[PDB]
Amino acid sequence: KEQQNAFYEILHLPNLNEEQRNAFIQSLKDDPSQSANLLAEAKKLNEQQAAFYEILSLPNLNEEQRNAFIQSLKDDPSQSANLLAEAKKLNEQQAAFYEILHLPNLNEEQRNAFIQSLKDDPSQSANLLAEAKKLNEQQAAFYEILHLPNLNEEQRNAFIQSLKDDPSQSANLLAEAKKLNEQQAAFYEILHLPNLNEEQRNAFIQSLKDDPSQSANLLAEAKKLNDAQA
């Protein structure tokens, strides 16, 4: 019975070529008593060559690392499991590494120390990248509201205080600030428009100080009137 099982299993080993497969099958033709051996040996070139494929397809390793794993596996065929996992671990460490090293809103202290905590404990890469990205978002937002040109410093340090207290609302505190910014912006450019009479200007100040939701629209209207009354 074992000749049939080993026969089928060798004929359906997915990671061998026809040369290897038919060589093994010819060996089974010579001495069927070597059945449990051949199958074993046979499949131990399977999960070897399969391994050669996977380490060949990990993109965050270099050639030296890859073919170094290939070599270290051709010398120790039975460790293909371990050497693979290790390899598939290293892929993370490097992938995280450069992703941490290419965040444009971190200074050199935060770089060298995130990266140093990566070299020290790679098992936490998944988290060290995460909070890095978070930080790279947060700090970025801090740099945007810090350079919005139409806010008095009370408004700036108010928003900054709010996001410092709660970084989970970052994208909502930024989009708020900009909003106010744009609104106030329009205000300025309405009062510095030369060809309007003070009736339309007072009415615009009132309606704007009521519904900023159409601020942009209002501004546009004003400008067009400014074009017509030149």
Residue numbers in the entry: 37 to 266
Paper text:
To design amino acid sequences that can stabilize the alpha helical structure of the fusion sites, we superimposed one or two turns of terminal alpha helices of connecting proteins using a molecular graphics program. Then, the amino acid residues important for forming a fused helical structure were chosen from the two natural sequences in the superimposed region. Our method does not require complicated computer calculations for the design process and can be used for the assembly of artificial protein complexes with predictable and rigid structures.
To test this design strategy, we used a protein A domain as the repeating module and generated 3-, 4- and 5-module repeat proteins. All these repeat proteins were successfully produced in E. coli and could be crystallized. In the crystal structures, all the repeating units were connected as designed. The twist and bending angles of the fused helices were very similar to those of the ideal helix. Interestingly, the protein A modules in the crystal structures, especially the last ones, exhibited significant structural variation, and close structural analysis demonstrated that this structural diversity was due not to the helix fusion but to the intrinsic flexibility of the protein A module. For this analysis, we downloaded many of the protein A structures deposited in the PDB database and aligned them structurally. The analysis showed that the three helices also varied substantially in orientation and position in wild-type protein A structures; this result implies that crystal packing selects one specific conformation of protein A from a mixture of several available structures.
